[PDB]
Design a protein around this ligand. Structure first.
Ligand SMILES: CCCCCCCCCCCCCC(=O)SCCNC(=O)CCNC(=O)[C@@H](O)C(C)(C)COP(=O)(O)O
Ligand code: SF4
Ligand code: SF4
Ligand code: SF4
Ligand code: SF4
Ligand code: FES
Ligand SMILES: [K+]
Ligand SMILES: [Zn+2]
Lengths: 48, 96, 208, 106, 84, 690, 51, 126, 114
């Protein structure tokens, strides 16, 4: 990649990162979907 | 762009973020929740509208076989640009 | 001629039809059906009482000489009364041929083991018993061969679940490997991959 | 090259995935595009067979040449959409070159 | 002890329900006239035994099988249920 | 073989009636001819040319969907000519069809894709550029991507014949001929998701279902709809434990192939405003989450405190017969007969004693069978859309004569509006009416009285007037004893089951004897409130949605929904059906009869049943027709009911019969799930503003 | 209908895209029947009995 | 000599190996599956099917996947006859609910009805 | 209602085979507990064997009883020559599983399972 450099894109990382396992910057999984069932919210005022 | 909740947690491009009282952020305690910084909706909003001379345009996303399947977009509505269903590029007919 | 269609030779079909007639008229007491497929493979479906005479005749006949047992298997079709279809594939090295012998059984009628005819039938019938629960008479040692020790149920049956009923994990309180009722972190997603349109009109069943 | 995600939430990768290692959830985005809200691939369930990258109609999911990603926990191999997009942004300078080198065969 | 509900289960077509059908045809109307506050629920089905349920106070139920009973002793069974 | 002709399919002989098409003979034999424009419930169009088959000794292939078999025809369905015709027609469709399969909602549900794989070629010769058509905005329910449209006119024929709107059509000519509306018109009637059903391509897709799931991954659960009292058979499509779609089921006696728009698109209300945990009022008067043990202990203590008329229950609309008989048994063990429903039926005369007094006795096949239908005080188009669809089908095919007493509403067919006054019942019963002599000309009349009309103050007077009218009609027309004229149309799913189980209809008993402890089994109509209820009253609301009954309750018990429980619902015909479990209730919500049984056990009066089959046994021993699933056993004793009605001496009011639902905006929100649905909110906004 | 088409044909043609979709979602339908195919494996005879 | 008499209901629950919870507490459904109304094909309405009652599917705390606790969630069995499904269900000891095959009613289809002189079946468009 | 017997013509010698199998299991339980170093005692192992037999005791079909005897002989022989290990033997007791009480209140408090 000095005579034939790769194609430049703006979303490509400008800084390469090595394996970051067992580091504070490691990968932690999570569900990327939002809340699916919305609970009823009781009113904040008493009926009596 | 990446925004933060009142909890301080970054909100993903899907709109997902944990609540203040949700216990599932202990997985991010002493670690990081990684969110992809490049938001595709913002990046495709930055793209200019291609100004073409035809009533029906053809899109493959560029690169020929490296792109998406070739589709045809009908640019009849002059009040709305035609959007590719695959790549999200916008096209507008030049009627001048 | 056609590069996408498998070529067909009818001499094998004629030879296997002649041999099927031969076996059928030699053993009318047991042979229930004889068919030759489009793949030129001879299938002979027999009564369970004639497994020993049929296998012995096919192994020891001068015209048959089916001295090599290819495999012994079972197919679970739980819509018929005798739900286990036991299939014997045999190979004749003298005549360079292959034959298939089919019979039927259910959960409560065992069939005769053919360990006296072929020796690989020992382990193959052990596999069939372990996977389907088909008992075999006069076996030297019929026991489980593939499942876990003390595994309850026969797993190759159609009504047995894919994931099973128990799963193993190490419990530190008892310091052992213990069995739990099975719980999956992600359930196996079943897919209904059947088109609503008929594919092969040659196999169109008549309406009920 | 615009920066839009190539994935169009068409679920053929998880339909063809022989180990059922891909889980996809989708909804229309705020601009109405057909995009995923969840794209999880389990490395501990994946068999690395390339069926997703050969069934993908828009070359979105790929098996890039990274193999030195062994982790110290079982969780870190449970990839989600953010991790897969980060991998795609990291390895785009090489994945695109490999696809350019080999795409005439496939 | 106070009667709260009467339920008559019968058949549209059965020899055992013929007397019950006759009783409902000729005598149910003035029964409802005499007790126009009591639910006499008439339920009929294909293959049920002719059965009579009397629900009293606090959930007690008395069950009387009136299979192959004609109109007059169906009437007297109803009278015994109403009175006690 | 009287009036039958012998034809041959692939050499196999079969008897067919005259007028039977080639496709109908082929499916009688057992082979499904390929089709794109033919639908067995739509009119024959014959334009897609996919059903072309070869008749023996005939040089030209014929369209099986339109051509009738003549005599002795040998239909060579799998011949070379038929295969070549199918290949050519699929090639012509896919020449201009767009490459949109991954971005298509019709992923594995595509008749075009499946028939391509089964009958078409495996490659293309189309080297030209494909056409493209701009999309339309016919509503927030049906998303239109008209480039995928193959111009089969199925949507146009459906809208013309079944929906009865005449709004869709083809504009243009040749390859430029576009299906849609010429003007910017919003196509929103009831029964409008069935165009999404019957569109074979993904041109007309569902906008709530847009880009959500795939048919191969969705699991199918065959259940019953509870949005109205028709009881339409449905499939709940659930993926990963979440309800994803609602589709109709084919049931020729209830709903045919279609479901209402509220049924199809109101499923998203089950994801909002859901009760998940039991709640109790605290010392500050606010609802707070608590445990099942604590909530049931509080309710059990109050139930041990009170008895008699001081304990009462009110049942709403989305209530199954299991919880109804559970609450009935519990209040009977505390000796309470105030088991009321929100929906009102007249108790005068026969009341709910005779089952024929409150049923659609003629039923929906009887709607197809009848010749004149008189609708009294009802708007069937919004009260029971599939019932009105069957009326329109009979009106098209059997030349049904429809008349209406009530306010003049658009029923998507032309009827005779006799007027909105209830005195016309007296006039027809006396026999001095033009429609009375129309009836005496007719042979098999059908008088359908609305439960919405029975909701009025003079409901008993209206019912006895209609009963007297029907008795006079049967006297003056001499109909058969097997033919039932009187019918009652209900709009509430729980009402028929409650009336069968013995619930007293209406809250008149509640108003007469105000209780100190009240159960609200899904009661969200607001019929009885704290203003006409005593001050120190203990309210427990058992339900799945917090809409009207939860904020006024002292204890809230989260029950299950119809998609979350296996349940019994009885339709207007009297037919009982059971919903199956599609998903499970969210949070700590349980099945409603299980909640009532656990409450009874804690209160110390244990109900004599523990399992669902034992609940069905209790239902059978109360009334043994709620266990006869999909059974239409007929009722009798209309003579006795009419005699008691005649001895009822009430008089009708002068108010015109105005149904509560005059417009589709009133149609869209009816119950708690519809009110909590955002899709119905969008529909109301679209039909009001847009 | 059995083997998937080339990717350029899939991205250009309608039938190729449809067949790619159906093959990579449902797969090809095999006509009913039973076969025993045995080949000379390096370890012996490898047999497959497909029904 | 080799033929005995048995007057029972052919119970094999002791040999199936299934736990007693998944025998006694399960309900099965025997039915011809309804045609998917998004299509018009009827090849999936030919064979009888037995399925089990739906059990609990909850959310995984880590990934949000659909976690389950019952093994008979994806178990669907195919039968050529309702009586065969009945025999299998009674043999395996599962309590069954059976619904009959819903066949489409025969319909009088006439292309000439679209162009009638006096009937209401005349269409206004094509 | 006439079928082919497996080993037993009727219930009598089937019960004889049951008694022989129970006799041999009762013999082997102390040897099992001593050889595979089980935490259990001899008494409750014999109780486990007995209540397994009482669990299977409701069947009266001679073919099913013969097959149960055959399976019991396989389990017993598998215990004679030690292939079934300590974990496999201790799987009979479910000591690591919290049992589900059968009352309606408890099954209501846990979840939706009947
Ligand atoms: C160390 C622990 C390891 C545990 C190992 C457990 C081994 C379990 C072996 C099971 C063997 C069987 O199930 S055979 C028994 C089933 N036989 C029958 O049901 C025959 C009919 N049963 C009866 O008549 C029963 O009443 C009796 C009590 C068996 C016979 O007594 P009757 O006389 O009144
Ligand atoms: S490479 Fe992995 S993720 Fe892709 S289809 Fe194969 S097993 Fe599935
Ligand atoms: S990764 Fe590719 S195959 Fe998978 S859903 Fe996205 S676009 Fe489709
Ligand atoms: S309608 Fe069918 S053929 Fe057309 S794009 Fe959609 S899936 Fe493909
Ligand atoms: S929109 Fe659909 S139903 Fe209407 S003509 Fe086009 S393909 Fe047919
Ligand atoms: S189905 Fe007959 S031409 Fe369309
Ligand atoms: K569609
Ligand atoms: Zn594009």
């Amino acid at each position: 990649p000095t005579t034939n450099p790769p194609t430049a894109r703006k979303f490509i990382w400008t800084n390469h990162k090595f394996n970051v396992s067992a580091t504070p910057e490691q990968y932690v999984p999570y569900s990327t979907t939002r809340k699916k069932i919305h609970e009823w919210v009781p009113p904040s005022t008493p009926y009596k | 762009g990446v925004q933060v909740s009142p909890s301080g947690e970054k909100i993903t491009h899907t709109g997902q973020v944990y609540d203040e009282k949700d216990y599932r952020r202990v997985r991010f305690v002493d670690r990081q929740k990684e969110v992809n910084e490049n938001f595709a909706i913002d990046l495709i909003a930055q793209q200019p509208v291609n100004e073409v001379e035809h009533r029906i345009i053809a899109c493959d996303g560029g690169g020929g076989a490296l792109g998406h399947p070739k589709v045809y977009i009908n640019l009849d509505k002059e009040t709305k640009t035609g959007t590719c269903g695959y790549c999200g590029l916008q096209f507008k007919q030049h009627h001048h | 001629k056609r590069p996408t269609v498998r070529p067909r030779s009818d001499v094998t079909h004629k030879q296997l039809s002649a041999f099927g007639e031969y076996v059928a008229e030699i053993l009318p007491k047991y042979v229930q059906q004889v068919q030759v497929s489009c793949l030129d493979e001879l299938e002979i479906c027999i009564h369970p009482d004639g497994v020993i005479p049929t296998l012995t005749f096919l192994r020891d006949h001068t015209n048959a000489q089916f001295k090599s047992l290819a495999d012994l298997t079972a197919v679970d079709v739980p819509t018929r009364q005798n739900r286990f279809e036991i299939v014997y594939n045999l190979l004749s090295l003298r005549f360079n041929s292959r034959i298939r012998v089919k019979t039927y059984a259910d959960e409560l009628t065992p069939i005769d083991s053919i360990v006296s005819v072929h020796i690989a039938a020992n382990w193959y019938e052990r596999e069939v018993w372990d996977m389907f629960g088909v008992f075999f008479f006069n076996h030297p040692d019929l026991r489980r061969i593939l499942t876990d020790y003390g595994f309850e149920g026969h797993p190759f049956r159609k009504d047995f679940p894919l994931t099973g009923y128990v799963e193993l994990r190490y419990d530190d309180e008892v310091k052992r490997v213990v069995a739990e009722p099975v719980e999956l972190a992600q359930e196996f997603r079943k897919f209904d991959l059947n088109s609503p349109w008929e594919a092969f009109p040659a196999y169109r069943q008549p309406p009920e | 090259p615009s920066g839009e995600e190539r994935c169009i939430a068409c679920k053929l990768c998880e339909a063809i995935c022989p180990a059922q290692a891909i889980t996809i959830e989708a909804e229309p985005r705020a601009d109405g595009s057909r995009r995923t809200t969840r794209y999880d691939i389990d490395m501990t369930k994946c068999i690395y067979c390339g069926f997703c990258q050969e069934a993908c109609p828009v070359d979105a999911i790929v098996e890039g040449p990274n193999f030195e990603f062994s982790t110290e926990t079982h969780e870190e191999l449970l990839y989600n959409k953010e991790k897969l997009l980060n991998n795609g942004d990291k390895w785009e300078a090489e994945i695109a070159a490999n696809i350019q080198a080999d795409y005439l065969y496939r | 002890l106070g009667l709260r509900e009467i339920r008559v289960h019968l058949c549209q077509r059965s020899p055992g329900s013929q007397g019950v059908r006759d009783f409902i045809v000729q005598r149910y109307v003035e029964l409802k006239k005499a007790h126009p506050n009591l639910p006499i629920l008439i339920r009929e089905c294909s293959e049920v035994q002719p059965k009579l349920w009397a629900r009293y106070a606090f959930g007690q139920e008395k069950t009387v099988s009136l299979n192959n009973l004609s109109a007059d002793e169906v009437t007297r069974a109803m009278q015994n249920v109403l009175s006690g | 073989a009287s009036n039958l002709i012998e034809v041959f399919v692939d050499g196999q002989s079969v008897m067919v009636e005259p007028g039977t098409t080639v496709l109908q003979a082929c499916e009688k034999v057992g082979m499904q001819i390929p089709r794109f424009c033919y639908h067995e419930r739509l009119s024959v169009a014959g334009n897609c040319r996919m059903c072309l088959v070869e008749i023996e000794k005939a040089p030209k292939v014929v369209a099986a969907c339109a051509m009738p078999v003549m005599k002795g025809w040998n239909i060579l369905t799998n011949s070379e000519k038929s295969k070549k015709a199918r290949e050519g027609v699929m090639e012509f469709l896919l020449a201009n069809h767009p490459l949109d399969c991954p971005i298509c909602d019709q992923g594995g549900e595509c008749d075009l894709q499946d028939q391509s794989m089964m009958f078409g070629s495996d490659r293309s010769r189309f080297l030209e550029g494909k056409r493209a058509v701009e999309d339309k905005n016919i509503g927030p329910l049906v998303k239109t991507i008209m480039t995928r449209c193959i111009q089969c006119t199925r949507c146009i024929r459906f809208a013309s014949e079944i929906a009865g709107v005449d709004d869709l059509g083809t504009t243009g000519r040749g390859n430029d001929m576009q299906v849609g509306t010429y003007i910017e018109k919003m196509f929103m009637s009831e029964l409008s998701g069935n165009v999404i059903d019957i569109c074979p391509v993904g041109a007309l897709t569902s906008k709530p279902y847009a880009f959500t799931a795939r048919p191969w991954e969705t699991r199918k659960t065959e259940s019953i709809d509870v949005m109205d009292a028709v009881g339409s058979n449905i499939v709940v499509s659930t993926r990963t434990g979440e309800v994803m779609r609602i589709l109709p089921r084919m049931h020729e006696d209830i709903n045919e192939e279609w479901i209402s728009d509220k049924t199809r698109f109101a499923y998203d209300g089950l994801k909002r405003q859901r009760l998940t945990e039991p709640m109790v009022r605290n010392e500050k008067g606010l609802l707070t989450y608590t445990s099942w043990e604590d909530a049931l202990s509080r309710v059990a203590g109050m139930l041990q405190n009170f008895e008699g008329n001081a304990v009462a229950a009110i049942a709403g609309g989305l209530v199954d017969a299991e919880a109804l008989v559970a609450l009935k048994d519990l209040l009977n063990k505390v000796d309470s007969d105030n088991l009321c429903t929100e929906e009102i039926f007249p108790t005068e005369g026969a009341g709910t004693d005779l089952r024929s007094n409150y049923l659609l006795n003629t039923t929906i096949a009887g709607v197809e069978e009848a010749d004149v239908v008189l609708l009294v005080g009802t708007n069937p188009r919004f009260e029971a859309p599939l019932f009105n669809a069957r009326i329109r089908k009979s009106w098209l095919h059997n030349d049904l004569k429809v008349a209406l007493i009530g306010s003049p509403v658009d029923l998507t067919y032309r009827y005779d509006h006799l007027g909105d006054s209830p005195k016309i019942l007296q006039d027809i019963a006396s026999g001095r009416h033009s429609f009375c002599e129309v009836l005496k000309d007719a042979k098999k009349p059908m008088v359908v009285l609305g439960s919405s009309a029975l909701q009025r103050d003079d409901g008993a007077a209206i019912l006895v007037a209609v009963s007297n009218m029907v008795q006079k009609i049967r006297v003056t027309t001499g109909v058969a004893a097997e033919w039932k004229v009187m019918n009652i149309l209900h709009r509430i799913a729980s009402q028929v089951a409650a009336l069968d189980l013995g619930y007293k209809p209406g809250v008149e008993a509640i108003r007469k004897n105000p209780p100190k402890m009240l159960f609200l089994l899904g009661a969200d109509g607001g019929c009885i409130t704290r203003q006409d209820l005593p001050k120190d009253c203990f309210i427990v609301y058992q339900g799945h949605h917090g809409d009207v009954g939860a904020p006024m309750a002292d204890v809230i018990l989260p029950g299950a929904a119809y998609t979350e429980k296996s349940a019994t619902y009885v339709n207007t015909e009297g037919r009982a059906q059971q919903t199956k479990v599609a998903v499970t209730p969210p949070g700590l919500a349980r099945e409603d009869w299980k909640i009532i049984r656990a409450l009874s056990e804690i209160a110390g009066i244990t109900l004599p049943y523990d399992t669902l089959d034992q609940v069905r046994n209790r239902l059978e021993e109360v009334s043994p027709n709620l266990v006869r699933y999909d059974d239409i056993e007929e009722t009798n004793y209309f003579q006795q009911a009419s005699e008691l009605a005649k001895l009822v001496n009430q008089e009708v009011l002068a108010d015109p019969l105005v149904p509560p639902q005059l417009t589709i905006k009133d149609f869209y929100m009816t119950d708690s799930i519809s009110r909590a649905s955002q899709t119905m909110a969008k529909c109301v906004k679209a039909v009001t503003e847009g | 209908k059995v083997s998937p088409p080339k990717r350029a044909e899939m991205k250009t043609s309608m039938e190729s895209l449809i067949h790619h979709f159906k093959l990579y979602t449902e797969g090809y339908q095999v006509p009913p029947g039973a076969t025993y195919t045995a080949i000379e494996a390096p370890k012996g005879e490898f047999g497959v009995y497909l029904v | 000599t080799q033929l005995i008499t048995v007057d029972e209901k052919l119970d094999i629950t002791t040999l199936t190996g299934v736990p007693e919870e998944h025998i006694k507490t399960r309900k099965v459904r025997i039915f011809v599956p309804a045609r998917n109304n998004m299509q018009s094909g009827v090849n999936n309405t030919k064979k009888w099917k037995m399925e089990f009652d739906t059990r609990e599917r909850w959310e995984n705390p880590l990934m949000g996947w659909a976690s389950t606790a019952d093994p008979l969630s994806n178990m669907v069995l195919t039968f050529s006859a309702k009586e065969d499904a009945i025999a299998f269900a009674e043999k395996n000891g599962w309590s069954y609910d059976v619904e009959e095959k819903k066949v489409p009613k025969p319909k009088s289809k006439s292309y000439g009805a679209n162009f009638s002189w006096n009937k209401r079946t005349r269409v206004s468009t094509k | 209602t006439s079928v082919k017997p497996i080993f037993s013509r009727d219930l009598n010698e089937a019960k004889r085979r049951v008694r022989e199998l129970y006799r041999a299991w009762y013999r082997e339980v102390p040897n099992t507990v001593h050889l595979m170093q089980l935490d259990i005692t001899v008494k409750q192992g014999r109780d486990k064997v007995r209540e397994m037999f009482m669990k299977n005791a409701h069947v009266t079909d001679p073919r099913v009883v013969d097959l149960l005897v055959i399976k019991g002989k396989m389990e017993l022989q598998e215990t004679i020559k030690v292939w079934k290990q300590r974990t496999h033997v201790m799987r009979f007791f479910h000591e690591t599983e919290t049992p589900r009480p059968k009352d309606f209140l408890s099954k209501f408090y846990m979840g939706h399972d009947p």
